[PDB]
Amino acid sequence: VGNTVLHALVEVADNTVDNTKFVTSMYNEILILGAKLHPTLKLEEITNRKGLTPLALAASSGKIGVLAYILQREIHEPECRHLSRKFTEWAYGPVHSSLYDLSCIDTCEKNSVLEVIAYSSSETPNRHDMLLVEPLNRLLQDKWDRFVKRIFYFNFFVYCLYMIIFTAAAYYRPVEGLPPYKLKNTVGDYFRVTGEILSVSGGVYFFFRGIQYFLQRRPSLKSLFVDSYSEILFFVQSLFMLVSVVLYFSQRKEYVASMVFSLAMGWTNMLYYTRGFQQMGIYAVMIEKMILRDLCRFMFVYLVFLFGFSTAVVTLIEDSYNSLYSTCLELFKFTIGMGDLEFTENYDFKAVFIILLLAYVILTYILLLNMLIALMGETVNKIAQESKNIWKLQRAITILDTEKSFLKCMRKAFRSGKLLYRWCFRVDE
Amino acid sequence: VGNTVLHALVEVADNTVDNTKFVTSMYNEILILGAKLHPTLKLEEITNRKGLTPLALAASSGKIGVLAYILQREIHEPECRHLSRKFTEWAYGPVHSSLYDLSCIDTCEKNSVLEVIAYSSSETPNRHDMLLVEPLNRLLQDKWDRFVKRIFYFNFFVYCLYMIIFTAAAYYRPVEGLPPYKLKNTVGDYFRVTGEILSVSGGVYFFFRGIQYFLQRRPSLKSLFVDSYSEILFFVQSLFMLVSVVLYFSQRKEYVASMVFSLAMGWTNMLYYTRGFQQMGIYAVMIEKMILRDLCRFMFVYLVFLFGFSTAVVTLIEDSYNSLYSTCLELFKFTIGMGDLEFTENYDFKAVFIILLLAYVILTYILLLNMLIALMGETVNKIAQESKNIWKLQRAITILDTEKSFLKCMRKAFRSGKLLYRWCFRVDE
Amino acid sequence: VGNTVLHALVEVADNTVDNTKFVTSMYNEILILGAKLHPTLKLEEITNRKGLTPLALAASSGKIGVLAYILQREIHEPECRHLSRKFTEWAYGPVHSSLYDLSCIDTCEKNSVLEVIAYSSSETPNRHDMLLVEPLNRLLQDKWDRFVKRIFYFNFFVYCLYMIIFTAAAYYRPVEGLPPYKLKNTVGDYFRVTGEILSVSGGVYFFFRGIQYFLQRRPSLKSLFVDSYSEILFFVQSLFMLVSVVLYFSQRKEYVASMVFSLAMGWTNMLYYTRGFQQMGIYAVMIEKMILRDLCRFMFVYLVFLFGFSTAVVTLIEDSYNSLYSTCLELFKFTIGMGDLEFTENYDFKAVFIILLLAYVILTYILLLNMLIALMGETVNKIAQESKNIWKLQRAITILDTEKSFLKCMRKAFRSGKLLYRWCFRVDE
Amino acid sequence: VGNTVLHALVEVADNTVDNTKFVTSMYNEILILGAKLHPTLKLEEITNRKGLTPLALAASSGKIGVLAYILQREIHEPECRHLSRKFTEWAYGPVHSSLYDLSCIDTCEKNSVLEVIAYSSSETPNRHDMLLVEPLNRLLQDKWDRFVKRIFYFNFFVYCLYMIIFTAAAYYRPVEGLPPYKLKNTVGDYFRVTGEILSVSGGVYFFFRGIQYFLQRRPSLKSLFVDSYSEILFFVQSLFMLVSVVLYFSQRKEYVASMVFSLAMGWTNMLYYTRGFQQMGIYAVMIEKMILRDLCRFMFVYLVFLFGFSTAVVTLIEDSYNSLYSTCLELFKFTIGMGDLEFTENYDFKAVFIILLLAYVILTYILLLNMLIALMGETVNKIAQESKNIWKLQRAITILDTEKSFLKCMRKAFRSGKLLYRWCFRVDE
Ligand SMILES: C=C(C)[C@]12C[C@@H](C)[C@@]34O[C@](Cc5ccccc5)(O[C@@H]1[C@@H]3C=C(COC(=O)Cc1ccc(O)c(OC)c1)C[C@]1(O)C(=O)C(C)=C[C@@H]41)O2
Ligand SMILES: C=C(C)[C@]12C[C@@H](C)[C@@]34O[C@](Cc5ccccc5)(O[C@@H]1[C@@H]3C=C(COC(=O)Cc1ccc(O)c(OC)c1)C[C@]1(O)C(=O)C(C)=C[C@@H]41)O2
Ligand SMILES: C=C(C)[C@]12C[C@@H](C)[C@@]34O[C@](Cc5ccccc5)(O[C@@H]1[C@@H]3C=C(COC(=O)Cc1ccc(O)c(OC)c1)C[C@]1(O)C(=O)C(C)=C[C@@H]41)O2
Ligand SMILES: C=C(C)[C@]12C[C@@H](C)[C@@]34O[C@](Cc5ccccc5)(O[C@@H]1[C@@H]3C=C(COC(=O)Cc1ccc(O)c(OC)c1)C[C@]1(O)C(=O)C(C)=C[C@@H]41)O2
């Protein structure tokens, strides 16, 4: 297959206890023997065919036990010490000054651990808990507090400012016919056009960030939304903004129709930032999961009921209200507690009409919505814990993005290590 | 009783571990003895008085342990090999190439394992997990993908086309008094009457499918709905369609009153197809259970409250609204969040009227509905797993129906097996 | 203390396994020894000052271990056989034909087992599962099917007929001032007054049944409602009916105000019968437990919010709506999804008014009601099983009432046993 | 660090079983040894640097094992038993007449056990369960019944009377312009102004109680609300009352705006007293927890959606409704089941407007609210058991407040102990 044994050791694991201990054993034996035989050449550096070291492979596939072992390897023996992943400085009883190597964790130049674990395919079974392995959890916490937190809040703040400017520009849009509109020398219009230009500028910036994202990642349609959800939403916002520009200069009023959707998305995309706050990000996570997972089925069923009874009632009535659309709305309104239940007298067979509406109300307003709540009930009872960590996963994503951009034309964003050397990082735990 | 010991061995099981091992033991003993004593005569063909082999008995009664043994039984000894149910071709470490016999599994011509599991009496305790026994799950998956998936989607699509034609025909029904109506030479009317003819044709087809179903199955009233729910709904749709035809030619306007229910049912019956999709079928299954199991109790209680307080308020008022029906609606509207709570002034004892309505609102709008939700809460926490499998059963039903119909006057729809020879099926697992 | 050893042996138990085995051991030893010493006199007949045998004491206090022992105790030794509670006739493998004595289990003349269980004080910890002890479950099932089922359905049916007559009489009440009203010789008047007479007759009958109930039971206020809930409701219906009679002849229109509550109460009392049907009685039990347990806390809190903010808003407005009652209703309507949220313009400080209403809406409509749902969620997840046994308890109550009344001036409601003898009852299980 | 070994022994625990036994062992051994070596000097009196004895330290930090031991520590060795915490008077079989010392439990003059538990920093992991340790539970129950219960009901009653007077005064406020208002010699004015004076007096009293509370406690902002919630609410009510006074004499009508919030605050603060009633205080606890914990996240998300789509729709429409506020209300009304869903025709692109509203309704009305319920569902399933103790904890707070105030210039609120002596307290258990 073109891979070394150490990768196959990764492939054969399954995160069970017996399996974990056995794979630990094989790692131990092969690493010590290889050290004794080829002390010049290091094995764990050697990549598989896809350019991943065994560490990154365990990270990529969700093999938490192997990964935990490899990150937690101390070698303190003659002629083997150089292969250690951690050491201990201070051997106090309750607390240890542990010291970890960061090789191929942030700097790998092919695929680092945070890269492969963070940007895995979403099938990776353990990406939620896998960051709780001590050195990674510690690094993300350190990077968060140290420099990324402030930049993230700045990004959130500037997004808020962008949205305030966009909202202000949109709300005070000119009302004349036939865009584009002449800038009047009054300062109010100067601010308006400035706001519009900044609004579009934000649109273009998000557009290009989205393109860079999809070009780098090349996600597939079958999993375009399971991952990459936020980026799609920002990208789509920008798409609507740009369409609004095109219509705005194409002498179409319809640009408003585009802008407002962008504006609506422009605001709701703020929830992207609430992700990464454990206290307040759970709603954004759960809205993502519900829309992607759960809305499709409920809304197919609901639309079957709405449409079926809608066409029943519109068939029944004859003569206002005679359109399928109007009756679709009138029957929708039962869902929002404003259904009139005798909204037309222009029809025949009152008993039929009322029986239909009562059947509709019982079927949706009572039966369907409660089953939605029932399913969500069992599910959330099962998956609150998984959302509570996918918060952390998105925080890791935020940190990786933050390091990638950094906007100084330099690489002085290192984490730690001031003592002889492979970028040691110290945890007192 | 008229049975052999092989069936009684099935009857004695109860799917407990000690019981399972013991029944396996007795099977092993009699298999070896039967081989050595009557090598010319096959055991498992031997039917009980009802023409059921021991395999189909273990399947029919829900005896998952015995079935799981029998389908997964390899005999590799001298003078006993011929009694094996499966063999192993490739003894690779993680995966095996097992080869299974399909004798009386899909082709029996009396009753097969899939037939007796899928069309069990619905008391069968383990019909949900019973298909998880490897060879059955593999057969259904294979035949689903291989032939039945496309035909099912075609059936769903044609049902969608039928429903679109029916809906279009119904919506554009003529408004002239006194049906039936003369065809006008304009093409719109030609399409209309063509749509009507196709609509009725679909009605007749579903009518006759339902009759064939009930004639073949002969279900009882006490369990007519617990099983066979979908077929009843399709049949009832067709019944309404036919009644609409009769009225349509009986010079009655009331055909509309019938057609719409068929129309309302026709669209709603689309959820039938949504069964068999693991994701999207969760709701349709639940609406089957919730209506059959849970609507009766809630609606008796609810109608007791609605009707009792309805009689109270209609008694109280005197003079518009004086009818029991109108007050029944006005008090229903509290259930849909549109109760006015002072909907009449033509009455006496304002304090009594308001106390009645407040008692009604608290009793239903707050207490009864929330208690429904509480009950469903416990239940769904307990039965999400059972729906998650009954998905599989509906998929099996779809497959068995598909094999039964097949509409070519030929039997070349087999799954597999071409080499020495009882329809060998390979599972690489 | 004035009781024998066996009562203390009952008292010392606590339904733990070690305790259960020990107490059964002491029972065994003392019963055999007492038989050897005093073969003339039986210990287990010996009553406390309260006239309770050790069996009825174990039953009364909720002691499953002792009770299950005593009811299921076979003694087949020389000079000890005579004190057995059950014997085994047919020792078939899977089923036994057991034969049980019913002495002091239905006929005691002081306090039988079904009496002390069904009419326990509701503190009895295990009355729910206590009927699952084989011979009691079997007795209640047999008595249910044999004669009590039909009588109960007849009782339910006659209550339905009474309620229909009452409802019909009330709905068609005369509308003229100053009751009572002279009848016209027309048949409508005769049916109305006949309906009224039967209505009152049902009222009086329920009144006297309630008095008989409370006189026999002598409940206390602190637990008047925790038990005896249904009897209180029937009694109160009757009280309202009688008050309606008094006002009806006291030349006051206000009799209507009374009648309707008895009418509404009357109809809702039908839920009493739904208890005893496992399929449909769960809602009646749930509503009983919810109203007694859970309505008080929610409605105090809710009324605090409704009243507090209601006083705030009525204070704020000045000038229609200026009364505290009207604003109480207007703020109630938010609870039923019909709150207008700008229902008055006759006030000052729109910002204050709206902030108040929004705070009110968030606090009740979104926050309080969902909290009710959350509490009930945890509770029902814990107590569905206990409701599922309160069904059994009310079944026992129904049967005991049925046997008590019986309305023939004879006692020939016995079930089985004709041969040498203490009312032998046979169970195949 | 300036502490003796006993405080460290307290610190090192973690309430695990092995830890519990080990720490009990070391503490026990060293205490006996020290008693043998320095019989003149008492150790447990020895405070840490913060002035806490080891008992109060174990109490302060949430250490159940250590505290349970120390409260339940009996020493029966020569020359050591004088340092026991309990003795046993009567060694009856099921119950013991235990006798406990209360030194530094209610009287310490630095920090007593009830002080450090009740007024812990709210991080203390077991404060809710800690009072279930027998002698404390007994102390609080005894003090509750003996004198505190009546005083608590009295102060609750007086708070109710204050609120009734305040409400009456506010409701009948004068309606002239320009406060303050001259009193007419009629009695109605005198009762009104008397009510106002008492209203303000209650305001001032609560103001000063709140100041005394915060001065004594010195809470921090980061945990001002996690603890001390009720006191903050009472204090804020008083602040609003005082602001109302200032405006009332500052010749501003706006005093009404302040008073009503105090009024709405005041009535709502009545829920404070439901805490400490297990039957009815659960809702106050759950509302505290919801508002502090859960409202912030939901309302940020909800306001993002409401505001985002509000800006969308208000942008879209042009011409009544053109303001952002009005559209914010119109879209809020969907949340309360009164959304009109076609509330304006003064706009363009009906399709866009309706799609926006439908997206808004689905996103909030169906999607956001139901998942608030889902999240709470998991939470309450996990935390009803902890609120069920937070009740008792607040009862402890009530008792400590009661003992602190006592308003007689005497200390005659002791429990028992009159013979040789450290306030012996008897528990018969
Ligand atoms: C591509 C995704 C699936 C999406 C994009 C648009 C069309 C969207 O419709 C949806 C489908 C939809 C349509 C109508 C109602 C509900 C959902 O949901 C989101 C998407 C749905 C959202 C809600 O999703 C969120 O913003 C929450 C969120 C959670 C976590 C995140 O990381 C996040 O990043 C932006 C956003 C709001 C809309 O963008 C919106 O405001 C409009 C008018 C339509 C919603 O498609
Ligand atoms: C025989 C069954 C029990 C049924 C047949 C009719 C009368 C039906 O009323 C019910 C009872 C009912 C009446 C009024 C409101 C709710 C339920 O539910 C279904 C039946 C109820 C349905 C909803 O249940 C379904 O059809 C969904 C479904 C789920 C799974 C399936 O396999 C399926 O196969 C078609 C259908 C819709 C109605 O057919 C409909 O649209 C009208 C106007 C009445 C509904 O009876
Ligand atoms: C004595 C009980 C507690 C009760 C008696 C009356 C006043 C009652 O108000 C209650 C309190 C109440 C008032 C207003 C709204 C809800 C509850 O609930 C019942 C009682 C509440 C009921 C609902 O409870 C039931 O009847 C269901 C029930 C369940 C199990 C049963 O065994 C049962 O026996 C009849 C009845 C309906 C009312 O009788 C009714 O219809 C009117 C107008 C008031 C209701 O008091
Ligand atoms: C400081 C707290 C957090 C609080 C103080 C005021 C502003 C309050 O708004 C809140 C926030 C708020 C605002 C609007 C709607 C909901 C919540 O909730 C309470 C506070 C919220 C309450 C409801 O919370 C409670 O008081 C119940 C309660 C539970 C336990 C207690 O020990 C308790 O002691 C008083 C009170 C009602 C208000 O006081 C009220 O009536 C008005 C008009 C605003 C509510 O802030």
Side-chain angles (χ1 to χ4, degrees), chain B residues 297 300 315 318 337 348 372 374-375, chain C residues 167 173 253 274 279-280 283 332 337 380:
Chain B
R297 65 174 77 96
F300 177 73
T315 300
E318 62 201 64
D348 217 305
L372 161 76
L375 293 169
Chain C
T167 305
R173 61 179 183 72
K253 200 178 162 200
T274 51
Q279 61 261 5
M280 290 182 77
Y283 268 74
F332 175 63
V380 74

PDB file of all heavy atoms in Angstrom, chain B residues 297 300 315 318 337 348 372 374-375, chain C residues 167 173 253 274 279-280 283 332 337 380:
ATOM      1  N   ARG B 297     -57.050   8.085  23.472  1.00  0.00           N
ATOM      2  CA  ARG B 297     -57.219   8.463  24.866  1.00  0.00           C
ATOM      3  C   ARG B 297     -57.273   9.970  25.024  1.00  0.00           C
ATOM      4  O   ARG B 297     -58.169  10.496  25.698  1.00  0.00           O
ATOM      5  CB  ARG B 297     -56.109   7.863  25.716  1.00  0.00           C
ATOM      6  CG  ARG B 297     -54.715   8.349  25.459  1.00  0.00           C
ATOM      7  CD  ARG B 297     -53.789   7.779  26.467  1.00  0.00           C
ATOM      8  NE  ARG B 297     -53.466   6.396  26.186  1.00  0.00           N
ATOM      9  CZ  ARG B 297     -52.384   5.978  25.534  1.00  0.00           C
ATOM     10  NH1 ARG B 297     -51.485   6.816  25.054  1.00  0.00           N
ATOM     11  NH2 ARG B 297     -52.198   4.684  25.348  1.00  0.00           N
ATOM     12  N   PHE B 300     -60.608  11.317  23.709  1.00  0.00           N
ATOM     13  CA  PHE B 300     -61.754  11.098  24.579  1.00  0.00           C
ATOM     14  C   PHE B 300     -61.737  12.088  25.720  1.00  0.00           C
ATOM     15  O   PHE B 300     -62.749  12.723  26.020  1.00  0.00           O
ATOM     16  CB  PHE B 300     -61.790   9.692  25.147  1.00  0.00           C
ATOM     17  CG  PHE B 300     -62.930   9.474  26.095  1.00  0.00           C
ATOM     18  CD1 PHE B 300     -64.218   9.357  25.626  1.00  0.00           C
ATOM     19  CD2 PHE B 300     -62.722   9.423  27.457  1.00  0.00           C
ATOM     20  CE1 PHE B 300     -65.262   9.173  26.490  1.00  0.00           C
ATOM     21  CE2 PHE B 300     -63.771   9.241  28.319  1.00  0.00           C
ATOM     22  CZ  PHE B 300     -65.034   9.115  27.838  1.00  0.00           C
ATOM     23  N   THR B 315     -75.437  26.403  28.016  1.00  0.00           N
ATOM     24  CA  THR B 315     -76.533  26.515  28.960  1.00  0.00           C
ATOM     25  C   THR B 315     -76.598  27.904  29.523  1.00  0.00           C
ATOM     26  O   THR B 315     -77.669  28.505  29.597  1.00  0.00           O
ATOM     27  CB  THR B 315     -76.336  25.556  30.112  1.00  0.00           C
ATOM     28  OG1 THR B 315     -76.282  24.216  29.635  1.00  0.00           O
ATOM     29  CG2 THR B 315     -77.453  25.694  31.058  1.00  0.00           C
ATOM     30  N   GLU B 318     -77.917  32.951  26.865  1.00  0.00           N
ATOM     31  CA  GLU B 318     -79.279  32.994  26.379  1.00  0.00           C
ATOM     32  C   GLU B 318     -79.442  34.288  25.614  1.00  0.00           C
ATOM     33  O   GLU B 318     -78.637  35.206  25.760  1.00  0.00           O
ATOM     34  CB  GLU B 318     -80.290  32.921  27.517  1.00  0.00           C
ATOM     35  CG  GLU B 318     -80.202  34.083  28.476  1.00  0.00           C
ATOM     36  CD  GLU B 318     -80.815  33.780  29.830  1.00  0.00           C
ATOM     37  OE1 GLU B 318     -80.297  32.887  30.532  1.00  0.00           O
ATOM     38  OE2 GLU B 318     -81.810  34.442  30.189  1.00  0.00           O
ATOM     39  N   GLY B 337     -55.068  28.679  20.385  1.00  0.00           N
ATOM     40  CA  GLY B 337     -54.523  29.981  20.668  1.00  0.00           C
ATOM     41  C   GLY B 337     -55.279  31.113  20.039  1.00  0.00           C
ATOM     42  O   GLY B 337     -54.713  32.182  19.842  1.00  0.00           O
ATOM     43  N   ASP B 348     -75.771  35.933  31.065  1.00  0.00           N
ATOM     44  CA  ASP B 348     -75.915  36.463  32.402  1.00  0.00           C
ATOM     45  C   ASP B 348     -74.878  35.800  33.296  1.00  0.00           C
ATOM     46  O   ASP B 348     -74.382  34.716  32.996  1.00  0.00           O
ATOM     47  CB  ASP B 348     -77.342  36.224  32.893  1.00  0.00           C
ATOM     48  CG  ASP B 348     -77.859  37.355  33.722  1.00  0.00           C
ATOM     49  OD1 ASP B 348     -77.181  37.708  34.712  1.00  0.00           O
ATOM     50  OD2 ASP B 348     -78.935  37.893  33.381  1.00  0.00           O
ATOM     51  N   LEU B 372     -50.279  15.548  27.880  1.00  0.00           N
ATOM     52  CA  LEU B 372     -50.000  14.797  26.667  1.00  0.00           C
ATOM     53  C   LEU B 372     -48.516  14.825  26.359  1.00  0.00           C
ATOM     54  O   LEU B 372     -47.902  13.789  26.072  1.00  0.00           O
ATOM     55  CB  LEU B 372     -50.811  15.396  25.520  1.00  0.00           C
ATOM     56  CG  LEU B 372     -50.463  15.149  24.063  1.00  0.00           C
ATOM     57  CD1 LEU B 372     -50.904  13.753  23.686  1.00  0.00           C
ATOM     58  CD2 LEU B 372     -51.139  16.203  23.214  1.00  0.00           C
ATOM     59  N   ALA B 374     -46.086  15.358  28.399  1.00  0.00           N
ATOM     60  CA  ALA B 374     -45.358  14.600  29.420  1.00  0.00           C
ATOM     61  C   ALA B 374     -45.372  13.106  29.123  1.00  0.00           C
ATOM     62  O   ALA B 374     -44.330  12.420  29.183  1.00  0.00           O
ATOM     63  CB  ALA B 374     -45.974  14.877  30.790  1.00  0.00           C
ATOM     64  N   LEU B 375     -46.543  12.587  28.781  1.00  0.00           N
ATOM     65  CA  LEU B 375     -46.652  11.174  28.465  1.00  0.00           C
ATOM     66  C   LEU B 375     -45.801  10.815  27.270  1.00  0.00           C
ATOM     67  O   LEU B 375     -45.005   9.867  27.324  1.00  0.00           O
ATOM     68  CB  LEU B 375     -48.090  10.829  28.161  1.00  0.00           C
ATOM     69  CG  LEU B 375     -49.034  10.944  29.328  1.00  0.00           C
ATOM     70  CD1 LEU B 375     -50.423  10.832  28.781  1.00  0.00           C
ATOM     71  CD2 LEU B 375     -48.753   9.850  30.323  1.00  0.00           C
TER      72      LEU B 375
ATOM     73  N   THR C 167     -77.837  17.082  30.585  1.00  0.00           N
ATOM     74  CA  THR C 167     -77.409  18.074  29.625  1.00  0.00           C
ATOM     75  C   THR C 167     -78.574  18.541  28.791  1.00  0.00           C
ATOM     76  O   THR C 167     -78.716  19.736  28.527  1.00  0.00           O
ATOM     77  CB  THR C 167     -76.332  17.490  28.736  1.00  0.00           C
ATOM     78  OG1 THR C 167     -75.267  16.982  29.536  1.00  0.00           O
ATOM     79  CG2 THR C 167     -75.796  18.525  27.858  1.00  0.00           C
ATOM     80  N   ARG C 173     -83.386  24.578  29.204  1.00  0.00           N
ATOM     81  CA  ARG C 173     -84.025  25.167  30.354  1.00  0.00           C
ATOM     82  C   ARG C 173     -84.909  26.312  29.883  1.00  0.00           C
ATOM     83  O   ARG C 173     -84.622  26.935  28.865  1.00  0.00           O
ATOM     84  CB  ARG C 173     -82.993  25.685  31.347  1.00  0.00           C
ATOM     85  CG  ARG C 173     -82.071  26.759  30.817  1.00  0.00           C
ATOM     86  CD  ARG C 173     -81.124  27.191  31.904  1.00  0.00           C
ATOM     87  NE  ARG C 173     -80.242  28.279  31.520  1.00  0.00           N
ATOM     88  CZ  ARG C 173     -80.625  29.537  31.360  1.00  0.00           C
ATOM     89  NH1 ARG C 173     -81.886  29.892  31.520  1.00  0.00           N
ATOM     90  NH2 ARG C 173     -79.741  30.452  31.020  1.00  0.00           N
ATOM     91  N   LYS C 253     -82.867  33.371  39.723  1.00  0.00           N
ATOM     92  CA  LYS C 253     -82.281  32.989  38.449  1.00  0.00           C
ATOM     93  C   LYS C 253     -80.927  32.326  38.630  1.00  0.00           C
ATOM     94  O   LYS C 253     -80.549  31.461  37.832  1.00  0.00           O
ATOM     95  CB  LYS C 253     -82.163  34.230  37.590  1.00  0.00           C
ATOM     96  CG  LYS C 253     -82.037  34.002  36.115  1.00  0.00           C
ATOM     97  CD  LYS C 253     -81.970  35.362  35.441  1.00  0.00           C
ATOM     98  CE  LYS C 253     -81.424  35.315  34.037  1.00  0.00           C
ATOM     99  NZ  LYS C 253     -80.939  36.672  33.642  1.00  0.00           N
ATOM    100  N   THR C 274     -62.831   6.299  33.177  1.00  0.00           N
ATOM    101  CA  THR C 274     -61.688   5.959  32.372  1.00  0.00           C
ATOM    102  C   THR C 274     -60.595   5.334  33.203  1.00  0.00           C
ATOM    103  O   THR C 274     -59.860   4.486  32.700  1.00  0.00           O
ATOM    104  CB  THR C 274     -61.165   7.202  31.692  1.00  0.00           C
ATOM    105  OG1 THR C 274     -60.993   8.229  32.675  1.00  0.00           O
ATOM    106  CG2 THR C 274     -62.157   7.680  30.699  1.00  0.00           C
ATOM    107  N   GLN C 279     -55.797   1.400  28.939  1.00  0.00           N
ATOM    108  CA  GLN C 279     -55.549   2.043  27.662  1.00  0.00           C
ATOM    109  C   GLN C 279     -55.887   3.521  27.715  1.00  0.00           C
ATOM    110  O   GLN C 279     -55.177   4.324  27.110  1.00  0.00           O
ATOM    111  CB  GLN C 279     -56.330   1.315  26.548  1.00  0.00           C
ATOM    112  CG  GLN C 279     -57.879   1.281  26.686  1.00  0.00           C
ATOM    113  CD  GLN C 279     -58.440   0.000  27.264  1.00  0.00           C
ATOM    114  OE1 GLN C 279     -57.706  -0.891  27.678  1.00  0.00           O
ATOM    115  NE2 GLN C 279     -59.762  -0.079  27.317  1.00  0.00           N
ATOM    116  N   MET C 280     -56.914   3.897  28.474  1.00  0.00           N
ATOM    117  CA  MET C 280     -57.474   5.233  28.421  1.00  0.00           C
ATOM    118  C   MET C 280     -57.567   5.907  29.767  1.00  0.00           C
ATOM    119  O   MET C 280     -57.929   7.083  29.817  1.00  0.00           O
ATOM    120  CB  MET C 280     -58.873   5.203  27.806  1.00  0.00           C
ATOM    121  CG  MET C 280     -58.857   4.887  26.361  1.00  0.00           C
ATOM    122  SD  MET C 280     -60.496   4.917  25.670  1.00  0.00           S
ATOM    123  CE  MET C 280     -60.761   6.665  25.534  1.00  0.00           C
ATOM    124  N   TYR C 283     -54.818   9.236  31.468  1.00  0.00           N
ATOM    125  CA  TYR C 283     -55.011  10.678  31.529  1.00  0.00           C
ATOM    126  C   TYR C 283     -55.778  11.096  32.772  1.00  0.00           C
ATOM    127  O   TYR C 283     -55.493  12.143  33.350  1.00  0.00           O
ATOM    128  CB  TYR C 283     -55.740  11.177  30.304  1.00  0.00           C
ATOM    129  CG  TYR C 283     -54.834  11.603  29.206  1.00  0.00           C
ATOM    130  CD1 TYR C 283     -54.164  10.670  28.458  1.00  0.00           C
ATOM    131  CD2 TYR C 283     -54.660  12.938  28.905  1.00  0.00           C
ATOM    132  CE1 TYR C 283     -53.344  11.040  27.434  1.00  0.00           C
ATOM    133  CE2 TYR C 283     -53.834  13.325  27.886  1.00  0.00           C
ATOM    134  CZ  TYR C 283     -53.172  12.362  27.148  1.00  0.00           C
ATOM    135  OH  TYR C 283     -52.333  12.704  26.110  1.00  0.00           O
ATOM    136  N   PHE C 332     -53.830  38.115  31.069  1.00  0.00           N
ATOM    137  CA  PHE C 332     -54.016  36.682  30.997  1.00  0.00           C
ATOM    138  C   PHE C 332     -53.931  36.221  29.563  1.00  0.00           C
ATOM    139  O   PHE C 332     -53.323  35.191  29.267  1.00  0.00           O
ATOM    140  CB  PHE C 332     -55.354  36.295  31.594  1.00  0.00           C
ATOM    141  CG  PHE C 332     -55.658  34.861  31.457  1.00  0.00           C
ATOM    142  CD1 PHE C 332     -54.871  33.912  32.060  1.00  0.00           C
ATOM    143  CD2 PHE C 332     -56.723  34.454  30.719  1.00  0.00           C
ATOM    144  CE1 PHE C 332     -55.145  32.590  31.924  1.00  0.00           C
ATOM    145  CE2 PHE C 332     -57.006  33.139  30.581  1.00  0.00           C
ATOM    146  CZ  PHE C 332     -56.221  32.202  31.180  1.00  0.00           C
ATOM    147  N   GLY C 337     -52.029  33.087  24.110  1.00  0.00           N
ATOM    148  CA  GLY C 337     -51.648  33.418  22.761  1.00  0.00           C
ATOM    149  C   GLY C 337     -52.570  34.388  22.083  1.00  0.00           C
ATOM    150  O   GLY C 337     -52.615  34.423  20.859  1.00  0.00           O
ATOM    151  N   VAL C 380     -42.527  13.082  35.105  1.00  0.00           N
ATOM    152  CA  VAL C 380     -43.196  12.010  34.378  1.00  0.00           C
ATOM    153  C   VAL C 380     -42.194  10.961  33.961  1.00  0.00           C
ATOM    154  O   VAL C 380     -42.499   9.757  34.025  1.00  0.00           O
ATOM    155  CB  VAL C 380     -43.977  12.550  33.165  1.00  0.00           C
ATOM    156  CG1 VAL C 380     -43.042  12.945  32.053  1.00  0.00           C
ATOM    157  CG2 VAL C 380     -44.951  11.509  32.669  1.00  0.00           C
TER     158      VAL C 380
END
